[PDB]
Coordinates of C-alpha atoms and ligand atoms in Angstrom, one line a residue:
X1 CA 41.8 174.7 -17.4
X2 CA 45.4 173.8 -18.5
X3 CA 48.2 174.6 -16.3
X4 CA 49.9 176.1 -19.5
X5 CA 47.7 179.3 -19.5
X6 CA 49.9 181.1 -22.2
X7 CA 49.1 177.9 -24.7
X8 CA 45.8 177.1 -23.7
X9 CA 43.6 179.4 -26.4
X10 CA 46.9 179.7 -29.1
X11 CA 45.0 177.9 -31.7
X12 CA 41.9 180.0 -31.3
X13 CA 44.4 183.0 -31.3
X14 CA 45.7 181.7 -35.2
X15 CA 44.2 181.9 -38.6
X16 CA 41.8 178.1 -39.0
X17 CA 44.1 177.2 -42.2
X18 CA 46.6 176.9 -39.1
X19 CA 45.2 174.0 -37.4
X20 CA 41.8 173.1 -40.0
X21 CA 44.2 170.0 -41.3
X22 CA 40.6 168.5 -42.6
X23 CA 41.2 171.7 -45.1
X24 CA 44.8 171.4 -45.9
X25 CA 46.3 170.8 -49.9
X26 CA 50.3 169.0 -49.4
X27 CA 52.6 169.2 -52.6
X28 CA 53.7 165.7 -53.6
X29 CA 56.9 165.3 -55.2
X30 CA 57.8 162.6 -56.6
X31 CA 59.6 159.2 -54.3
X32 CA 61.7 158.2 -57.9
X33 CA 64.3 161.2 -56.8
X34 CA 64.9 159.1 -53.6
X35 CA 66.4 155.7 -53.8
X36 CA 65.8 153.3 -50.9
X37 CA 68.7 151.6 -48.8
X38 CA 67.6 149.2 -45.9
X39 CA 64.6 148.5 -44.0
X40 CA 64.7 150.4 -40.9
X41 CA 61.3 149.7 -38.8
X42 CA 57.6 149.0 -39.3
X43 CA 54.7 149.8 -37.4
X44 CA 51.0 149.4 -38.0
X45 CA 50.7 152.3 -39.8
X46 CA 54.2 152.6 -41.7
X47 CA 57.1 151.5 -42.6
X48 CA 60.4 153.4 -42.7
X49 CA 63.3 153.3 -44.7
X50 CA 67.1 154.3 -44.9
X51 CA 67.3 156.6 -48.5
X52 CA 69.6 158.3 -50.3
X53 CA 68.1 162.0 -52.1
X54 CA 69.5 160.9 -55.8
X55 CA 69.8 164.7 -57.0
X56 CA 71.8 165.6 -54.0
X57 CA 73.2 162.3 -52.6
X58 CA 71.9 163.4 -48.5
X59 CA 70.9 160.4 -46.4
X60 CA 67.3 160.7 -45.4
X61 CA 64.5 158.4 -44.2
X62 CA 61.8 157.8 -46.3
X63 CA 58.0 156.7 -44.3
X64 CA 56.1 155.4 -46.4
X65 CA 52.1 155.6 -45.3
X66 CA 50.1 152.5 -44.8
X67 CA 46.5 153.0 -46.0
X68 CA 44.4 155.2 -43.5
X69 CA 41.9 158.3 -43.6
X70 CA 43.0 160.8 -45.8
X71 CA 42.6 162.8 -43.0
X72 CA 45.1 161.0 -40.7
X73 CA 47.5 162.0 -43.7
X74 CA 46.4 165.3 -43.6
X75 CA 46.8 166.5 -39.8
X76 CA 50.3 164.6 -39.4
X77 CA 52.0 166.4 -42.7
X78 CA 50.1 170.1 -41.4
X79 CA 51.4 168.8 -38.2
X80 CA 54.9 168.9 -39.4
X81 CA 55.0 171.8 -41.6
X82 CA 53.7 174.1 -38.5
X83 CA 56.7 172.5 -36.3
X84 CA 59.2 173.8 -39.3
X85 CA 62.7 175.0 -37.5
X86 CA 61.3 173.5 -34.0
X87 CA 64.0 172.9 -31.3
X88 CA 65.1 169.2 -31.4
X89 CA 61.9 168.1 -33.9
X90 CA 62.6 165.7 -36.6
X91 CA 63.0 167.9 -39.5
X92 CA 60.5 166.9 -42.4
X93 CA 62.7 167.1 -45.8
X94 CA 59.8 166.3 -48.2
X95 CA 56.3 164.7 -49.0
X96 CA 56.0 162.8 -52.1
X97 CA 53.9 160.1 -53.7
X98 CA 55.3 156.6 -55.3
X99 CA 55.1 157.4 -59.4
X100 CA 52.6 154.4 -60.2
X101 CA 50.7 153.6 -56.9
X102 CA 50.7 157.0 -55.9
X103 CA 51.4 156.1 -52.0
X104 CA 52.1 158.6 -50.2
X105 CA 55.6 159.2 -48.1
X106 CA 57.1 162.0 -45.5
X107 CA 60.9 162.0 -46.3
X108 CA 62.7 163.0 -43.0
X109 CA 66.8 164.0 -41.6
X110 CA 68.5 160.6 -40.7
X111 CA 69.6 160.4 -37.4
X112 CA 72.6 158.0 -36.3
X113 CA 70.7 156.7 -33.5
X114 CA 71.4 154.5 -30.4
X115 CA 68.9 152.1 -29.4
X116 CA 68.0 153.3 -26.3
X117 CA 68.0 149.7 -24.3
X118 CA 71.9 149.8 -25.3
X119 CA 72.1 153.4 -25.0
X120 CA 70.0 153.7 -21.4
X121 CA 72.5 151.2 -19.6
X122 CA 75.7 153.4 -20.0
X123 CA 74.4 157.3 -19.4
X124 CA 75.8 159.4 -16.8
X125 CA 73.7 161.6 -14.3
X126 CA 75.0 164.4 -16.5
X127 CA 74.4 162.7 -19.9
X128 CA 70.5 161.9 -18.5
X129 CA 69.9 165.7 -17.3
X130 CA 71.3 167.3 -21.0
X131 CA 69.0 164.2 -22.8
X132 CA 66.2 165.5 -20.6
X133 CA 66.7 169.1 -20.9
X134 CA 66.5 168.5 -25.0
X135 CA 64.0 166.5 -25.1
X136 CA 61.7 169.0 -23.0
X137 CA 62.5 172.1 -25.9
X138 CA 61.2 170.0 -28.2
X139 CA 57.6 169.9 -26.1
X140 CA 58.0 173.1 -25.3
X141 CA 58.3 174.3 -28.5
X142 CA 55.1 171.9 -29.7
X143 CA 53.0 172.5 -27.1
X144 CA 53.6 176.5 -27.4
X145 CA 52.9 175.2 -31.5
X146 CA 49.3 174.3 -30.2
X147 CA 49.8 170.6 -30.8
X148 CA 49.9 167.6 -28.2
X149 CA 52.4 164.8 -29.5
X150 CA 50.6 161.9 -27.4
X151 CA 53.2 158.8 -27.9
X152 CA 56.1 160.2 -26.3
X153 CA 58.4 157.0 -25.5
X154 CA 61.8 155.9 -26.0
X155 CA 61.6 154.7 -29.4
X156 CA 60.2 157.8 -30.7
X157 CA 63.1 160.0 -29.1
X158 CA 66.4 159.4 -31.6
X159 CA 69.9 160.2 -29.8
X160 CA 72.8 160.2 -31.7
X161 CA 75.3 159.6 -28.5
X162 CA 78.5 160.9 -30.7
X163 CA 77.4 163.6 -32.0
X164 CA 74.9 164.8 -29.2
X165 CA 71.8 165.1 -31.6
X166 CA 68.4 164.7 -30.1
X167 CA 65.1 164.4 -31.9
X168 CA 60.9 163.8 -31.5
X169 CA 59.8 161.3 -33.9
X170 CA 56.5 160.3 -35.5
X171 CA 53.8 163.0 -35.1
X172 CA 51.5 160.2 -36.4
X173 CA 49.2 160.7 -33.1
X174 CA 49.9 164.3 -32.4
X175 CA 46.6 166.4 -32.5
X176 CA 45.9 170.3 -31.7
X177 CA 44.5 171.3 -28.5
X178 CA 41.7 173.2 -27.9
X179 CA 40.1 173.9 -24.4
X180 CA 37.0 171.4 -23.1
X181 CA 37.4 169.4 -26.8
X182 CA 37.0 165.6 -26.1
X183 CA 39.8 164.1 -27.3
X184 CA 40.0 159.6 -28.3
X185 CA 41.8 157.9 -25.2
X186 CA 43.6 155.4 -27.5
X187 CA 47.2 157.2 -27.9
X188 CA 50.4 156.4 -26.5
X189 CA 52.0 152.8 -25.6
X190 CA 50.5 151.6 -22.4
X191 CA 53.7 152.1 -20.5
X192 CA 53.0 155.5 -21.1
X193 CA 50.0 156.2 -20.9
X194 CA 48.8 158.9 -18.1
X195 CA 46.2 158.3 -15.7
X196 CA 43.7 160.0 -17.6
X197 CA 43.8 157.8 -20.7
X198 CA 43.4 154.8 -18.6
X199 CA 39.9 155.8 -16.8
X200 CA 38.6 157.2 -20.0
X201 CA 39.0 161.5 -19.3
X202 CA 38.8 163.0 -22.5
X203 CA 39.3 166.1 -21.8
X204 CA 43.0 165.9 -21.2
X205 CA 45.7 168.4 -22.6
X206 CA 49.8 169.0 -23.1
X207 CA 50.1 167.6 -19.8
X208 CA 49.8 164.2 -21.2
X209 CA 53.1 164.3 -22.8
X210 CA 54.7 165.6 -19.1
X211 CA 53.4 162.1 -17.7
X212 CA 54.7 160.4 -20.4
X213 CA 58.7 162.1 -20.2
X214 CA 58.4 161.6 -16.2
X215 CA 58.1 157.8 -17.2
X216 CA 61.2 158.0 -19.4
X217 CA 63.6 160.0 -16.5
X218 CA 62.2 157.2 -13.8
X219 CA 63.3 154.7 -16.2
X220 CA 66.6 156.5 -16.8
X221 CA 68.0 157.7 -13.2
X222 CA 66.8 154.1 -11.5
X223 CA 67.7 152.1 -14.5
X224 CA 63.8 150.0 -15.0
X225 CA 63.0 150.3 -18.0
X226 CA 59.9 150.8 -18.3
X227 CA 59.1 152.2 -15.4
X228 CA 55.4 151.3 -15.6
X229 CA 55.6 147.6 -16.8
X230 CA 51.4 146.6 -17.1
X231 CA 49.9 143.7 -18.7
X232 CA 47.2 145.2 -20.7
X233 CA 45.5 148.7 -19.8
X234 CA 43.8 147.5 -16.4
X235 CA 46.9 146.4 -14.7
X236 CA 48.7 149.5 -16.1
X237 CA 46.7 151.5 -13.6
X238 CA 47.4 149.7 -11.1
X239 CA 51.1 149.3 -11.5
X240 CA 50.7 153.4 -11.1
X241 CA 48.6 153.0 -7.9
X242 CA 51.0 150.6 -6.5
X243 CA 53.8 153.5 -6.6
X244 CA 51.1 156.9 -6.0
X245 CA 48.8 155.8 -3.8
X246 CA 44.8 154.3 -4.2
X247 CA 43.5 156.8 -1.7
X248 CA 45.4 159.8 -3.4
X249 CA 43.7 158.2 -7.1
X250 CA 40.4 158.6 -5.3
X251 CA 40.8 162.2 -4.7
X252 CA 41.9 162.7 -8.3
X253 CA 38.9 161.3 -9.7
X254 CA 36.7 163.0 -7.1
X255 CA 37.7 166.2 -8.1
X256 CA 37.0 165.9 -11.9
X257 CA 34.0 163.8 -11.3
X258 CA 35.0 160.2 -13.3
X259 CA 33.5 157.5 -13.4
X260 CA 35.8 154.5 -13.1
X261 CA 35.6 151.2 -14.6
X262 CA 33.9 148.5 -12.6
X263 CA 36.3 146.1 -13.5
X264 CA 39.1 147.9 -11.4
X265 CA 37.0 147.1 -8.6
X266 CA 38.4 143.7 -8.6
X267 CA 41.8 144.9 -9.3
X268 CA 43.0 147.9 -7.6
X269 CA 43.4 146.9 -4.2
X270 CA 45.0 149.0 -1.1
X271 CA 48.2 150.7 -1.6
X272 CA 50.0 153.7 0.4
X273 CA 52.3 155.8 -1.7
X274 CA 55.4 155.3 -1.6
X275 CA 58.7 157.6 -1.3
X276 CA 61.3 157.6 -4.4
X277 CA 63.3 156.9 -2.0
X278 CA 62.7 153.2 -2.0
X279 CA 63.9 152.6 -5.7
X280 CA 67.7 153.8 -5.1
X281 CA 70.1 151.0 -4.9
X282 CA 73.7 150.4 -5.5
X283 CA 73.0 150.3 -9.3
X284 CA 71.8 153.4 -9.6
X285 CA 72.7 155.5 -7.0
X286 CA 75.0 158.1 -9.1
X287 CA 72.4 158.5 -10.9
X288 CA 69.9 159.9 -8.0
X289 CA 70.4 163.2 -6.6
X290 CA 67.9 165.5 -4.6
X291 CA 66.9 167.5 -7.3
X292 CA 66.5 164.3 -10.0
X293 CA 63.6 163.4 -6.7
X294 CA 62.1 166.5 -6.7
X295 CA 61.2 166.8 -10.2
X296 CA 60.3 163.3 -10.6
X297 CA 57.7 163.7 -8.1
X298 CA 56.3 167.1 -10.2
X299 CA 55.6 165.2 -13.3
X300 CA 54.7 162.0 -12.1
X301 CA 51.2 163.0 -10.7
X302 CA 47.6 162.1 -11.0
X303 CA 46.2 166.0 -11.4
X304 CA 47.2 166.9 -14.5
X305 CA 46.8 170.5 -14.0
X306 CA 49.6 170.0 -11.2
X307 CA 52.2 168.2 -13.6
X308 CA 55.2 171.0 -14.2
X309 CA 54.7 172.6 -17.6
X310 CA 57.5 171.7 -20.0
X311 CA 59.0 175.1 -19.5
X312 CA 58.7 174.7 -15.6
X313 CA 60.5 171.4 -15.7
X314 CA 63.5 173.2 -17.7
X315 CA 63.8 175.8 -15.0
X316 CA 64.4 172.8 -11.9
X317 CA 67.4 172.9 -10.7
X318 CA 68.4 169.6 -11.7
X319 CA 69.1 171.1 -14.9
X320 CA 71.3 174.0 -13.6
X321 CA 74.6 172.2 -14.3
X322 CA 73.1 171.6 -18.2
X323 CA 72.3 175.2 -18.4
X324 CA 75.8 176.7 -17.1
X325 CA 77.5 174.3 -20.1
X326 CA 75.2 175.9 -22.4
X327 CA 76.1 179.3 -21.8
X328 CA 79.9 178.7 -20.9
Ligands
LN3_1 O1 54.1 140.9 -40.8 C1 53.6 139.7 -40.8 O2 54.0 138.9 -41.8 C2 52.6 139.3 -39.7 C3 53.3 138.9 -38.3 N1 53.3 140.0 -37.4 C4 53.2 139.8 -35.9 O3 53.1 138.8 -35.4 C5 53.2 141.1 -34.9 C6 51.8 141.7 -34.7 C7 50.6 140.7 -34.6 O4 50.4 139.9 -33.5 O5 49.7 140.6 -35.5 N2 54.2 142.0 -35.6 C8 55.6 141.9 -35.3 O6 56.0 141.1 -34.5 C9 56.6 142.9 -36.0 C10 57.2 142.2 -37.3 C11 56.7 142.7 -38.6 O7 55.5 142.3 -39.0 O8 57.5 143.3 -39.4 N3 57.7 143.5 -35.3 C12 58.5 144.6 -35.9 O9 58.2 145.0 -37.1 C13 59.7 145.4 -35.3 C14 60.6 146.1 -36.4 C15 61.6 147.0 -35.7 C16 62.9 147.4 -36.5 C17 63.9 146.2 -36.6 C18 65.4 146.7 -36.6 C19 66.1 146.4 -38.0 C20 66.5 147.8 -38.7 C21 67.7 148.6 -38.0 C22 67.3 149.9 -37.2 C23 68.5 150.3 -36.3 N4 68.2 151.4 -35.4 C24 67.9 151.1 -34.0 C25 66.4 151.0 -33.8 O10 65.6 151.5 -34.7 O11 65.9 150.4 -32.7 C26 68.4 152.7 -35.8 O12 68.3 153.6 -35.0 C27 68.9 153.0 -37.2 C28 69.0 154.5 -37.5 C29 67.7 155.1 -37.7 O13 66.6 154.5 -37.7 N5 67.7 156.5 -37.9 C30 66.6 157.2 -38.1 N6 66.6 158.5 -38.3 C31 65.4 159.0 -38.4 C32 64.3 158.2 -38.3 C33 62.9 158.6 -38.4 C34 62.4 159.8 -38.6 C35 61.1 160.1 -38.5 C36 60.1 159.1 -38.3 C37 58.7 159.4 -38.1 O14 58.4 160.7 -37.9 O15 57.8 158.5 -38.1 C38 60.6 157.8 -38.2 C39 61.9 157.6 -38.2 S1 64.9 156.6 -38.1 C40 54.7 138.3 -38.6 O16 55.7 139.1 -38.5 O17 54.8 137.1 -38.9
LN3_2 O1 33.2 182.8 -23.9 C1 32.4 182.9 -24.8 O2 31.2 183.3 -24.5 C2 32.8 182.7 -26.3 C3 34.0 181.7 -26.3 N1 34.7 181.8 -27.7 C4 35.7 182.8 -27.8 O3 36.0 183.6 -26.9 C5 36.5 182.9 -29.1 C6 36.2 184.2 -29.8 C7 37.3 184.6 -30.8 O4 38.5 184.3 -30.6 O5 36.9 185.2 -31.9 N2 36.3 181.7 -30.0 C8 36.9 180.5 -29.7 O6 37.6 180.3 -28.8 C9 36.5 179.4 -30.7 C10 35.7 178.2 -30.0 C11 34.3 178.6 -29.6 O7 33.9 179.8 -29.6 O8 33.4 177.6 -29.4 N3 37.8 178.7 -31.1 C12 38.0 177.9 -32.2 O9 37.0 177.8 -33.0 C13 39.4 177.3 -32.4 C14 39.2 175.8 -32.5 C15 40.5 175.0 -32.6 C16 40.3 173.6 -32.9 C17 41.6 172.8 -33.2 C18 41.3 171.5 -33.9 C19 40.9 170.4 -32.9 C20 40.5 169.0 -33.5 C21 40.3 167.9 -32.5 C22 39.9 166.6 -33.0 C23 39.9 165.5 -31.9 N4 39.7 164.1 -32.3 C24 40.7 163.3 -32.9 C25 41.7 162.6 -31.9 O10 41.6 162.8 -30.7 O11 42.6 161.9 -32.4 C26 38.5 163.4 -31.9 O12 38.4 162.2 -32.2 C27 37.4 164.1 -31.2 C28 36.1 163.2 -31.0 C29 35.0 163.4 -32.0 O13 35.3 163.5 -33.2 N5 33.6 163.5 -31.5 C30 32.5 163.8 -32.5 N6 32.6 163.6 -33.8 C31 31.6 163.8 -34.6 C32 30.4 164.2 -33.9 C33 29.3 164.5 -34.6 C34 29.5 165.2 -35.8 C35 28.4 165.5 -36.6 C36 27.1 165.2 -36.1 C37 25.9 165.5 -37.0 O14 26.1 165.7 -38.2 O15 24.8 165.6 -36.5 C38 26.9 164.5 -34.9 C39 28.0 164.1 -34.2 S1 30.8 164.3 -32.2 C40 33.7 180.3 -26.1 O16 34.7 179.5 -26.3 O17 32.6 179.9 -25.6
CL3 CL1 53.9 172.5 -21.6

């Protein structure tokens, strides 16, 4: 079972209206009390906007919901109401539908954001281990929530770099675990996608999401960006096995009795693992420190019931020096 015993059976332990999003009534208000401002993104299944709230004047976004399953609409807005208050989570403002089309729309907090290839290039060891350490609340506090976010990646982590703001964005793939469910495999971008997803395990869990923000510190102490750079789900896997080891993905799949594609057969090749050692260099070297190693190499494995925990990665010591500012 999951590593996180203490989260694994939450759901079960909750009333179903909890996590039966199938079930679940939103109130829609109505999107004529918000008045739109600039294009900010768009994405196959929404686009986002700057907004201004028109009773209040507060800047806001406003995502307005391409057409899908009503249920899709459903689990991300229950989704977001049980996350209400969460450390570091995007707080949700409002749901409302357009007054003649009747589309729906989450209205969300605007964040003055950095895009993080700017922002990635100029953070110090310290600035990487407080991002980190705020970014890890946030999945603890989901994950202890019941839910799995499952597209953890740089775009979907807004940092305002003045005022020191951090949130989780887009709960559009997040789901609620439940033990031995069979989850779909087709979640996260394919630089950060874990292991599992990319030999077709289904029966995966938080841990996902600790593969997924090991990518982001590799990329952030040794400055590649992304760390795991494939051409199309086949090569992704063996950009992994090129850094972990084929004979140590053997053992993982061994143990949990997958079958793997036939077509990595042709790919995969021989490849020892190799030390974290190898990707220091002058350009990132004050950035790289023991304890950044140490923890690197506890989320960024195959077994994901050996991955730290979220709460396990915030007690490493390469967070002590965040946690003494925090209480100074
Ligand atoms: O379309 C067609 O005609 C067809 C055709 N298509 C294609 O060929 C292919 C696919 C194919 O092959 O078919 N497609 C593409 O190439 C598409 C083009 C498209 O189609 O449009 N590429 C894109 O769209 C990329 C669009 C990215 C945004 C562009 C940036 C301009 C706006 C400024 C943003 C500035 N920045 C940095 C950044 O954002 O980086 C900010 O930070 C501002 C502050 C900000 O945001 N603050 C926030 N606070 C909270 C937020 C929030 C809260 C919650 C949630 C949530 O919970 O969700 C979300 C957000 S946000 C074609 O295009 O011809
Ligand atoms: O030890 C024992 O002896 C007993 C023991 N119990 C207990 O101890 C306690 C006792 C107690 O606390 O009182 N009870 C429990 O713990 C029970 C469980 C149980 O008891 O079982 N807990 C619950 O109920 C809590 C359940 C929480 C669920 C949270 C919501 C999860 C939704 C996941 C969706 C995933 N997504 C979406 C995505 O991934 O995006 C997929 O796509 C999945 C793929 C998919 O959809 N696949 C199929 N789709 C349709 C199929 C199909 C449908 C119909 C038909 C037909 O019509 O023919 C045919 C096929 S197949 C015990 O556990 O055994
Ligand atoms: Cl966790």
């Amino acid at each position: 079972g999951s590593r996180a015993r203490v989260y694994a059976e939450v759901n079960s332990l909750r009333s179903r209206e909890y996590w039966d999003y199938e079930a679940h009534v939103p109130s829609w208000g109505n999107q004529d009390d918000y008045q739109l401002v600039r294009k900010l993104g768009r994405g196959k299944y929404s686009e986002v906007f700057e907004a201004i709230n028109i009773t209040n004047n507060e800047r806001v976004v406003v995502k307005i919901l391409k057409p899908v399953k009503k249920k899709k609409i459903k689990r991300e807005v229950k989704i977001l109401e049980n996350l209400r208050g969460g450390t570091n989570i995007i707080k949700l403002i409002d749901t409302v539908k357009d007054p003649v089309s009747k589309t729906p729309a989450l209205v969300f907090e605007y964040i003055n954001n950095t895009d993080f290839k700017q922002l990635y290039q100029i953070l110090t060891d310290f600035d990487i281990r407080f991002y980190m350490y705020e970014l890890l609340k946030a999945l603890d506090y989901c994950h202890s929530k019941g839910i799995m976010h499952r597209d953890v990646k740089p775009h979907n982590v807004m940092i305002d770099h003045q005022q020191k703001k951090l949130r989780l964005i887009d709960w559009g793939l997040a789901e609620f675990y439940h033990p031995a469910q069979e989850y779909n495999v087709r979640v996260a971008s394919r630089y950060f996608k874990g292991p599992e997803l990319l030999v077709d395990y289904q029966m995966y869990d938080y841990s996902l999401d600790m593969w997924s923000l090991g990518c982001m510190l590799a990329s952030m102490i040794f400055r590649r960006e992304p760390f795991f750079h494939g051409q199309d789900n086949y090569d992704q896997l063996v950009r992994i096995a090129k850094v972990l080891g084929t004979e140590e993905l053997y053992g993982y799949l061994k143990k949990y009795h997958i079958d793997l594609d036939p077509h990595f057969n042709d790919i995969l090749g021989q490849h020892s693992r190799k030390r974290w050692e190898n990707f220091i260099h002058s350009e990132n070297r004050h950035l790289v420190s023991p304890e950044a190693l140490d923890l690197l190499d506890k989320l960024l494995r195959y077994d994901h019931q050996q991955r730290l925990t979220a709460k396990e990665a915030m007690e490493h010591p390469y967070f002590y020096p965040v946690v003494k500012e925090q209480s100074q």
